Design a protein around this ligand. Structure first.
Ligand SMILES: [Ca+2]
Ligand SMILES: [Ca+2]
Ligand SMILES: [Ca+2]
Ligand SMILES: [Cl-]
Ligand SMILES: [Cl-]
Length: 139
């Protein structure tokens, strides 16, 4: 290639202020990550029965065009006797992240229709050139 080929490294750290998504429980949250409308989707594990889940899971997503790519983060509640319940989502433009910076930030999610509040999610995001160590700060 005659241009840089960037990688999106994302740590899904934790969430807070989640809504009650179960009549007899609290929330069993997991997060789904999707670049643009890609068929490669990533999902975290489920953290049962808490409004403040901690996942600390890392994902590595090749980028097509840092000037236009978007990362959608979608929170859902796992259920056992019914289908999972959508909670909230945020679409994050990749072009807002300085190349090579490790950015650790909280994000407000937008609740889906019918959900009272969307929560916040903490993501550590690092746009780095191909081969660079994920989450390694610039030197
Ligand atoms: Ca539920
Ligand atoms: Ca549930
Ligand atoms: Ca359900
Ligand atoms: Cl609620
Ligand atoms: Cl930049």
């Amino acid at each position: 290639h005659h241009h840089h080929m960037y990688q999106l490294h994302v740590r899904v750290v934790e969430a807070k202020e989640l809504p009650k998504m179960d009549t007899f429980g609290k929330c069993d949250a997991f997060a789904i990550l999707q670049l643009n409308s890609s068929r490669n989707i990533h999902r975290t594990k489920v953290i049962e029965k808490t409004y403040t889940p901690v996942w600390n899971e890392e994902f590595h997503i090749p980028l097509e065009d840092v000037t236009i790519d978007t990362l959608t983060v979608f929170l859902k509640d796992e259920d056992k006797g019914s289908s999972d319940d959508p909670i909230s989502l945020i679409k994050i433009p990749i072009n807002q992240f300085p190349l090579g910076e490790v950015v650790d930030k909280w994000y407000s999610l937008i609740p889906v229709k019918g959900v009272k509040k969307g929560g916040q999610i903490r993501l550590t995001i690092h746009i780095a050139p191909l081969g660079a160590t994920p989450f390694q700060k610039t030197d």
